[PDB]
């Protein structure tokens, strides 16, 4: 019992701004990912622990990376790569960011049991660094893909085909927003930060520890604008906040830039070992 | 069959831009390159094989600074300066770009050769600065210009004299932009860093290696905004990215302003010699 | 194929109401909006109405409003139309046509007006 | 809303002969993304209208290659290079564009 208003197209400036945004993530973060990867999965290998996981890390970041011409294309012409593709798109943008997320909160566990538990926990830490991350972290990720697995296709409008996620009513829409949300801020930053709150209070009454704090507040700062902007969105979304339609769409371009800005996750990576390493 | 919209002229505050952005890249260059030129060609010379690469991009640098008020006279005002400056202007600019390219693949190349066969080839390195830079670097560079050369020259509409490039029909400057990118980013750049993954996997299995990776990267990041501006253009003018006009003229703007900002490649040479050397 | 049917045509006094099904089938029913447009008898064709069957976002044409009431029925796929307090002039023929497109990014609405169903005719004596 | 005017209103055509109707509008049909959504629909006598061309000039698949139309700005055209005898029957031209939709006033074509 409410009228629509239907949401208009990005300006122009949008649609030259993605493009080189997206242009400029995939040439530094395919050569950053290729080689950090090389080097540390082929020939030199990892000395400490951490580098095991920032591999994981690193791999994660190459699949997010190879999607991103698609990205592009369909942020400048029309879609023309076909059904099994957008599906396979979505799969892996919606695998590499949770992966991403867990491989933090695992630095972090890991951390914590290096720093407090040091003399009586060496043979658990290699126990979770080799066996447990994989179902820790690649299980739960490939888990949450199906409902982007049934829900994402492409539509065809006129003479334009549209790869998207249609979803059977609104409210769909809503519970996916929350449990991104609950799953990729919330609860790992709950974890992370009493993590660090336990180091600091044990260090009070080290390299390592300011390399790790490095990654994950730089990862934290360039994806917080983005949830702010879901937030309000799914808010808007429960008539909650009914401030108008121009408001809806000035948040939809906020959306969307601010997830164009924070794809840098994927590049920061391989950039502190050029600077810290 | 299809109807045209005219091409609108630029912003006021782009008529006020675009002639200070030009005097300050020509006055830091201007300095920048005398300098550096003078000392390196003659008195003290130069120590490393790296610098003799560098005294070519010294010398492109000049070259392409010495039209920059010419620049600034036409954004202001009319052209006065005659059909034959217009056609050395556009020599002069076509030759130097390629040139200062070419010399940066060419200390890639040199890179590669000291690092994987420093024992084995000292002799090639030598004969390769010495005497085929010559012909790899300034031949092609002066080849490339006929096309300029020809179709390079000044039009009187009413009062107003316009120094611009005549084209036989369309295609030409579609053709001409696809050998601009192809010359200017995508052999290079592939040269370059496949140069650099040997290097870095030879290592994993330097001073000089982080002063001409730094020269590259910023190089390559101020160019880069300009051809995923022309790229679109070529799109739009094959009827593949039919977006309308206004982001015609949008994407002639963003053209316009990268590629006034992106003339920093001639002022990053001597700097380096400030910070690093 | 994708096709839209409509039910049977009516007879109603002045004064009732009458409520006409459109049941649309041969595609992913919650993804297109369904607009319904209305023919008079030797006239120019005339919109009246469009709901959004995503998340049931209806609107009316002023000329209408405030004596339709339109609604749809996801679970069966049906798009239903009530209309009240009917007039001496609204013996027509009504038609259902798929209009919009509805997803989770794009909610745009000029792409449609492609299939249309075989239409009602409804009198008023 | 936008009005669109369709000339003419009777259209006596002889078979084998091309024909052309033309409607113009009150606004300018040029959207924000940069197209222009104005189609025509041909409605034969006791049956729904159907599609012919969708946009200016793109044809609609189904239809044979007689059909075609175009136009820019405020003023439109569609015209049929041959005449047949399945051809009789009202034609109207929409627009997509502005909320809400606005349909023609409508030309049948008989046979002369």
């Known amino acids: 019992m409410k009228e629509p208003c239907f949401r208009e197209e990005n300006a122009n400036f949008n649609k030259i701004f993605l493009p080189t945004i997206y242009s400029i993530i995939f040439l530094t973060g395919i050569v950053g990912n290729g080689l950090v990867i090389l080097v540390m999965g082929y020939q030199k290998k990892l000395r400490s622990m951490t580098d095991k996981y920032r591999l994981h890390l690193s791999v994660a970041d190459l699949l997010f990376v190879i999607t991103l011409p698609f990205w592009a294309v369909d942020a400048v012409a029309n879609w023309y790569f076909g059904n099994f593709l957008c599906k396979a798109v979505h799969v892996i943008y919606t695998v590499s960011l949770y992966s991403s997320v867990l491989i933090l909160a695992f630095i972090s566990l890991d951390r914590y049991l290096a720093i407090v538990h040091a003399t009586n926990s060496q043979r658990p830490r290699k126990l979770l660094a080799e066996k447990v991350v994989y179902v820790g972290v690649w299980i739960p990720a490939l888990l949450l893909t199906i409902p982007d697995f049934i829900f994402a296709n492409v539509s065809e409008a006129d003479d334009r085909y549209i790869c998207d996620r249609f979803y059977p009513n609104d409210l769909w829409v809503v519970v996916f927003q929350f449990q991104h949300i609950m799953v990729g801020l919330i609860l790992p930053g709950i974890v992370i930060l009493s993590c660090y709150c336990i180091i600091i209070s044990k260090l009070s009454h080290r390299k390592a520890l300011k390399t790790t704090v490095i990654l994950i507040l730089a990862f934290f700062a360039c994806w917080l604008p983005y949830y702010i902007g879901i937030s309000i969105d799914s808010f808007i979304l429960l008539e909650i906040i009914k401030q108008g339609c121009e408001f809806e769409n000035t948040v939809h371009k906020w959306i969307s830039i601010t997830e164009a800005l924070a794809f840098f996750h994927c590049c920061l990576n391989p950039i502190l070992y050029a600077f810290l390493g | 069959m299809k109807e045209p919209c005219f091409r609108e002229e630029n912003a006021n505050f782009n008529k006020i831009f675009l002639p200070t952005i030009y005097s300050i890249i020509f006055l830091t260059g201007i300095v920048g390159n005398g300098l550096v030129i003078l000392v390196m060609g003659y008195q003290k010379k130069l120590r490393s094989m790296t610098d003799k690469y560098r005294l070519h991009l010294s010398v492109a640098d000049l070259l392409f600074v010495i039209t920059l008020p010419f620049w600034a006279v036409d954004a202001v005002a009319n052209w006065y300066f005659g059909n034959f400056l217009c056609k050395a202007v556009h020599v002069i600019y076509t030759v130097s770009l390629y040139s200062s390219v070419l010399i940066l693949a060419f200390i890639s190349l040199d890179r590669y050769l000291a690092i994987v066969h420093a024992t084995n080839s000292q002799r090639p390195r030598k004969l390769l600065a010495e005497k085929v830079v010559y012909v790899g670097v300034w031949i092609p560079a002066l080849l490339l210009t006929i096309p300029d050369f020809i179709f390079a020259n000044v039009s009187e509409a009413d009062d107003r004299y316009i120094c611009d490039r005549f084209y036989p029909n369309d295609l030409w400057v579609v053709v001409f932009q696809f050998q601009h990118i192809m010359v200017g980013l995508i052999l290079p750049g592939i040269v370059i860093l496949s140069c650099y993954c040997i290097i870095i996997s030879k290592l994993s299995h330097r001073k000089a290696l982080k002063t001409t990776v730094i020269l590259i990267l910023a190089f390559f990041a101020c160019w880069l905004p300009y051809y995923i501006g022309i790229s679109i253009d070529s799109f739009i003018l094959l009827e593949i990215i039919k977006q309308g006009c206004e982001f015609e003229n949008t994407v002639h703007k963003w053209i316009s302003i990268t590629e006034a900002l992106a003339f920093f490649h001639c002022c990053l040479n001597p700097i380096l010699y400030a910070f690093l050397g | 194929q994708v096709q839209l049917v409509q039910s049977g045509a009516e007879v109603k006094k002045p004064g009732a109401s009458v409520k006409v099904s459109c049941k649309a089938s041969?595609?992913?029913?919650?993804?297109?909006?369904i607009s319904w447009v209305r023919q008079a008898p030797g006239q120019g064709i005339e919109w009246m109405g469009w709901?959004?069957?995503?998340?049931?976002?209806?609107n009316y044409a002023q000329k209408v409003q405030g004596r339709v009431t339109m609604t749809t029925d996801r679970s069966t796929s049906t798009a239903y139309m009530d209309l009240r307090s009917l007039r001496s002039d609204d013996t027509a023929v009504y038609y259902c046509?798929?209009?919009?497109?509805?997803?989770?990014?794009?909610?745009?609405?000029?792409?449609?007006?492609?299939?249309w169903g075989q239409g009602t005719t409804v009198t008023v004596s | 809303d936008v009005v669109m005017t369709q000339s003419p209103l009777s259209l006596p055509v002889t078979l084998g002969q091309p024909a052309s109707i033309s409607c113009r509008s009150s606004?300018?049909?040029?959207?924000?993304?940069?197209?222009?959504?104005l189609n025509w629909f041909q409605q034969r006598p006791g049956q729904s209208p159907r599609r012919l061309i969708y946009?200016?000039?793109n044809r609609d698949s189904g239809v044979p290659d007689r059909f075609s139309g175009s136009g820019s700005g405020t003023d439109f055209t569609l015209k049929i290079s041959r005449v047949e005898a399945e051809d009789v029957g009202f034609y109207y031209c929409?627009?997509?564009?502005?909320?809400?939709?606005?349909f023609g006033g409508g030309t049948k074509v008989e046979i002369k």
């Open positions: 929409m627009q997509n564009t502005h909320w809400p939709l606005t």
């Open positions: 046509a798929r209009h919009g497109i509805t997803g989770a990014r794009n909610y745009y609405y000029h792409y449609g007006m492609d299939v």
């Open positions: 041969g595609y992913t029913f919650t993804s297109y909006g």
């Open positions: 709901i959004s069957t995503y998340n049931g976002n209806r």
């Open positions: 946009k200016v000039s």
């Open positions: 606004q300018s049909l040029v959207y924000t993304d940069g197209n222009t959504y």
